[PDB]
């Protein structure tokens, strides 16, 4: 089932790759010219080889076969030749790799693990180069372990690539179901169209495609009685996957529970980008000074959940429900945004211009480099002399100075430290 992809520019030793790789063609998938992987290998997958009978020249053939690769393939191997480090040509491959939520491993071709010295590669972000000698098979292995393990992570529902998927998650009696319904009955709204696929609410808003992640959860309490919540929450957290947005719902009235923290940290945990709703609003009566000392109150509790913004609203009064999917696409813009290396660097080394790098005991940190790795959410690697030196209360100090240059509310980021 999983599908992998090749993509490089032209002359990078693609095919001597594949034809290493691809087993044999099997002319009852979702089909192209598809190969399944190698039987000598022991990871079972298909290999996807492009062929899209727009324009001809150049520029515009990488165009049509990386398209096709982002549309179809579920992890995607692209592919430099390290005969002369990256190019500018490399670089515009990388740019058109970049508008894809799929994950992206690069294939250094022509190496050793030594030859693979240039930073040029990790600029690209993509995450860490593996060296490959296509000659003789050397580095194959560890690369396609790195291809291996996003296959846990592959969606058995799929949507078109320009999709939004998203969660509203809460405990028993919060609004998530009229909140939805609300925000259905909404203006700016649109629905869409048995079973395989009739478990998310599929709408679209400003010409926007939209999907609800497990509508049927809510749809499910309505037909069968409360046996226990520990049945909801995981099927919240198997919703989390396959969304990339948490609408974290708490309710008003009563405020904050325990188990709001146990729903919201996985989503944490997971990296999505995460979105309070405070519910019921309405039934909250309220004072001169009341809502922002709610504020306040949640931001202890939940002080994993600083980078989310925090609305209030009612589904019942209909207010602030307007405020709901303006927020969501923040921060899927946020999740998926993508930032350039050079821009990065002099935030970086703006960081350091201020507050200086920790000592231990003479021997100082120095920050070399740092590139962002991956999207959803932003990752990023700070290149140091000792990782171990690099204490938390500075790798965040980071990530403040980060979420200053390119804004960042919705989604959390994560910073690593590698050397050398
Ligand atoms: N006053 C007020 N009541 C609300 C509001 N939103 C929802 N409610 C009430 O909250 C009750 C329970 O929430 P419900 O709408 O079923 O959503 P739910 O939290 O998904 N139910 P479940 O937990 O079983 O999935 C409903 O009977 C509804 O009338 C609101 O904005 N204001
Ligand atoms: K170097």
């Not at 492009?50 to 995607?76: K, S």
Request: glycine share 6%.
């Amino acid at each position: 089932k999983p599908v992998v992809a090749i993509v490089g520019r032209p002359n990078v030793g693609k095919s001597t790759i594949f034809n290493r790789i691809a087993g044999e063609r099997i002319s009852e998938d979702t089909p192209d010219r598809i190969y399944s992987s190698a039987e000598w290998l022991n990871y079972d997958f298909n290999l996807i080889d492009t062929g899209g009978i727009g324009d001809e020249p150049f520029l515009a053939q990488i165009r049509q076969q990386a398209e096709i690769a982002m549309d179809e393939a579920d992890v995607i191997i692209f592919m430099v030749n390290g005969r002369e480090g990256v190019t500018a040509a490399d670089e515009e491959v990388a740019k058109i790799l970049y508008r894809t939520k799929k994950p992206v491993v690069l294939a250094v071709n022509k190496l050793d693990n030594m030859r693979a010295n240039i930073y040029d590669f990790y600029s690209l972000g993509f995450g860490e180069p593996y060296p490959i000698s296509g000659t003789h098979g050397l580095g194959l292995g560890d690369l396609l372990d790195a291809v291996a393990e996003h296959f846990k992570n592959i969606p058995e529902t799929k949507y078109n690539e320009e999709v939004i998927q998203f969660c509203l998650i809460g405990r028993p009696n919060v609004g998530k179901s009229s909140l939805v319904n609300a925000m259905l009955g909404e203006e700016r709204v649109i629905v869409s169209n048995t079973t395989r696929d009739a478990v998310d609410t599929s709408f679209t808003y400003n010409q926007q495609e939209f999907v609800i992640v497990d509508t049927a959860g809510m749809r499910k309490k309505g037909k069968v009685y409360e046996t226990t919540e520990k049945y909801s929450v995981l099927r919240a957290l198997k919703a989390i996957d396959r969304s990339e947005v948490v609408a974290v719902v708490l309710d008003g009235e009563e405020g904050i529970i325990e188990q709001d923290k146990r729903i919201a940290g996985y989503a944490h945990e997971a990296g999505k980008a995460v979105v309070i709703v405070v519910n019921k609003w309405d039934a909250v009566d309220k004072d001169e000074s009341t809502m922002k000392e709610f504020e306040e109150n949640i931001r202890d509790h939940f002080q994993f959940l600083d980078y989310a913004p925090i609305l209030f609203m009612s589904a019942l009064t209909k207010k602030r429900i307007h405020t709901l999917m303006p927020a969501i696409i923040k921060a899927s813009e946020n999740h998926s945004l993508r930032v350039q290396t050079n821009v990065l660097n002099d935030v970086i080394m703006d960081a350091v211009a201020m507050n200086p790098t920790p000592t231990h005991n003479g021997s100082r940190l120095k920050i070399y480099y740092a590139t962002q790795v991956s999207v959803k959410p932003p990752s990023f690697v700070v290149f140091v002399n000792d990782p171990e030196l690099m204490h938390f209360s500075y790798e965040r100090f980071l990530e403040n100075r980060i979420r200053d240059a390119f804004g960042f509310e919705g989604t959390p980021i994560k910073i690593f430290a590698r050397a050398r």
